Amino acid sequence: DIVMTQAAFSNPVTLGISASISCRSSKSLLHSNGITYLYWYLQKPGQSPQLLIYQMSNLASGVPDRFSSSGSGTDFTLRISRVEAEDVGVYYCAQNLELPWTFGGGTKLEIKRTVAAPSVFIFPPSDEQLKSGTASVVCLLNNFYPREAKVQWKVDNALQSGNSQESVTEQDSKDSTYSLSSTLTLSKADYEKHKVYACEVTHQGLSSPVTKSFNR
């Protein structure tokens, strides 16, 4: 019934330092019996949540000794010593001093690695898709950091205001990069009105915008 609050959406950190993720509760989690009913869970990309720490001071089985919980009463911190690339994921605090269990909104741990430019790849539509009356053009930005990137579609040098959408991977657990797709979809009739299809990419690691294009 207690409100659990994790003010930060994300916590960027460099490798090898101690990270700290904050959690606050609306009432003390300390029982008269001396136990603080605070828990920490981690949800790594693509996995279910997993228990890290239970009742403030106990490590779950299999969890490395680099995780510890500090604070008292209503203000707590999860500390991760010597952060590793594989630590990325969403960290949730939780309590069960009073039922129901309640959870913080999560804080995503992010590795600050060196800036890395995207490799930009472009895929024209398949004959199979065209035979069905639509054309999807896919621009791929592979293995870059930071996550922020601008992808613009230009058709015969005309900037496109719509008809595209993006998807971004979670930060990779091994190389700390992101990848991104931008997909432009047109009717086959509209696709065949134009010649040159191009995605123009802006990113911290590029000294100027990069365009990859093909001629239909």
Added chain:
Amino acid sequence: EVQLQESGPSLVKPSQTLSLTCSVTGDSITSGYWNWIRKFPGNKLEYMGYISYSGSTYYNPSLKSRISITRDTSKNQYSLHLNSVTAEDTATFYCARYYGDNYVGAMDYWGQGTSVTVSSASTKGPSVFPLAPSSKSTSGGTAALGCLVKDYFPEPVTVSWNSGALTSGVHTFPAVLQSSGLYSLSSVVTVPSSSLGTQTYICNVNHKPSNTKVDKRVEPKS
């Protein structure tokens, strides 16, 4: 250790009752406490309730009027029923074990989670299109190729490559709703350029809600 597996429909119509089942192996549900939690699309977690080793039940007061939990001890399964659902109930639903007592314990083992979407729309299976490798998708000795998995409903879809033999360099992007209200995603892989001459690349796509299952060979293009 203990293994928990959620099952049930991936799509439920609004106003209907949603029912899910958690199958437990490696432990008996006649000891401990057995929980349901859900994760909303924006990552907020909500505890729903538990059924105890004795069959007694606890429900989150915010949900008490809409939920029932049941069990079948012979099958070592327990179930969640959520009444009168709306799109506000769309979430990933988890079962999880609580080990311990009123004094000391934790929710330790969670299931893998199962997606449930609340909509009156009919299921739709994906079209699977090749993303063909070409010089437009290569950098030196590295080539990218993939599969576009387009116009399906609801989540989830699973994608593998060469029946799981190819995992290095694979990115399967999160599905994103299109302006049609249907999902689309690509799965891509980066491979040595030279391999394109003798290695075949096949994406395996499985969309269980619509009974669509497709293997698509991805050939080089000029």
